[PDB]
């Protein structure tokens, strides 16, 4: 089997892409936050808290015929950016652009902190990184890539994101004709329960590249390009009047210049980024001060090639006994 469904920027930014998906029967169709950062596949639901609904679409289990409530189990996650849900768990029918998980675990939010209750466009994240970091407690539940790959074609899905525009994830083939070139694979360790993976080095615009192993994850649910301090201040030295803003939270620039691009390297292959994709604007509105969109990872603890990085690429994530990833130009 396969699947294949459209991914949506939430606003003019970027900030986060939506994908429609069908829960229950009759479907009841959620737009969720597909996440490779993370492994829970959880909604706002009729067992939201009701003062912590604001305009999502709810799931509710009662009107499914195929809802089963997973008896005791329960699940609570708190993301990088600080935001955070919880509450029970019902296992029922999930399709995905034409692809269907029987049994799937859907975890159903009794509370959400302010950011998830704040942004009207999300209804919901679906986990893809490794089922390891799946929060359902006394019994750790599959993703829905876990659960689906023994199914599939092949056992793998690609993130093809756009840039203000839509694209597309498809699970289980690869689309030979939605990337040019080759697609260049590398190693991942799956030992932190991420798609965990070397990019072999990095440029600024027309720069000399620099060959230095920088470890990260592929994360469709995070915006920004998070990189080590050193990395990230050689990008931002090439904008006039850019600094690093303790008060804002980051990198700010003039709303007046023109970004560079920024390369990373997939072993002997390059992804570039075009500085426009840089750009995440204004940052409070009417400001001619503009936010980065490649940030500093220290204090994270992680290096994050988040959405700004992923959407210059058609990107493989390879669900083989050993797990790989795949990057190709587009």
């Known amino acids: 089997s396969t699947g294949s469904a459209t991914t949506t920027p939430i606003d003019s930014l970027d900030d986060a892409y939506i994908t429609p998906v069908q829960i229950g029967t009759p479907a009841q169709t959620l737009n969720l936050d597909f996440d490779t950062g993370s492994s829970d596949l959880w909604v706002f639901s009729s067992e939201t808290t009701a003062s912590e609904v604001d305009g999502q679409t709810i799931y509710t289990p009662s009107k499914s015929t195929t809802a089963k409530l997973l008896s005791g189990a329960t699940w609570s996650i708190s993301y990088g950016d600080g935001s955070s849900s919880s ?24 509370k959400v902190s302010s950011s998830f ?11 893809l990184a490794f089922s390891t970091l799946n ?17 599939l074609d092949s056992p793998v899905f ?27 694979y590398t190693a991942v360790s799956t030992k932190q329960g991420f798609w965990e993976w070397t990019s072999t080095g990095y440029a600024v615009g ?15 649910g995070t915006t920004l390009l998070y990189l080590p301090a050193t990395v990230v201040s050689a990008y931002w030295a090439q904008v006039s009047g850019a600094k690093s803003s303790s008060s804002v939270g980051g990198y700010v620039f003039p709303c007046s210049a023109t970004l560079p691009s920024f390369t990373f390297g997939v072993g002997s292959a390059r992804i570039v980024i075009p500085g426009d994709y840089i750009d995440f604007g204004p940052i409070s509105t009417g400001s001619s001060s503009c936010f980065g969109g490649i940030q500093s990872s220290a204090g994270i603890g992680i290096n994050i090639f988040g959405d700004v ?5 058609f990107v493989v994530f390879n669900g083989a006994t050993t797990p790989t990833l795949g990057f190709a130009s587009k």
């Open 309 to 313: 990085a992923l959407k210059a690429a």
């Open 135 to 151: 929060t359902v407690s006394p019994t750790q539940q599959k993703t829905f890539f876990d659960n689906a790959k023994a199914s």
């Open 158 to 184: 690609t993130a093809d994101l756009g840039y203000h525009a839509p694209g597309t994830y498809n699970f289980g083939f690869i689309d030979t004709t939605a990337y040019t070139g080759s697609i260049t």
């Open 87 to 110: 509450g029970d768990v019902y296992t029922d029918t999930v399709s995905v652009g034409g692809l269907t998980v029987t049994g799937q675990a859907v975890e159903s939010a009794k």
């Open 117 to 127: 209750t704040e942004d009207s466009t999300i209804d919901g994240l679906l986990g």
């Open 206 to 220: 027309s720069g000399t590249f620099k060959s230095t192993s920088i470890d990260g994850i592929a994360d469709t």
